[PDB]
């Protein structure tokens, strides 16, 4: 999230996340009007 340079849309980057505890409470420190829209899972309880 805090990377300085994101890749272009056509050559979009891919990263694999594994073998780690994922805390999503931090993700709310983004721009005040960040869209956080989810499919298949309620964003409120993605920490369980």
């Amino acid at each position: 999230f805090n990377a300085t340079r994101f890749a272009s849309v056509y050559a979009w980057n891919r990263k694999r996340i594994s073998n780690c505890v994922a805390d999503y409470s931090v993700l709310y420190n983004l721009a005040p009007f960040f869209t956080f829209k989810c499919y298949g899972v309620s964003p409120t309880k993605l920490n369980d």
């Binding site: 298949g40 899972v41 309620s42 409120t44 309880k45 369980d48």
Partner: protein
């Protein structure tokens, strides 16, 4: 059978989704199972006759 829902486990739906669409998913599953039970009852009655 999923009956068009995202999953066929009740607790799975209650754990992966917030209510507002959990009611829709649960309603679909419940009505499907209820219809299956009705059908079983109807053929049981016919065979009993």
């Amino acid at each position: 059978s999923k009956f068009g829902a995202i999953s066929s486990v009740l607790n799975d739906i209650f754990s992966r989704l917030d209510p507002p669409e959990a009611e829709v998913q649960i309603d679909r599953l419940i009505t499907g199972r209820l219809q299956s039970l009705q059908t079983y009852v109807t053929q049981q009655l016919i065979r009993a006759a």
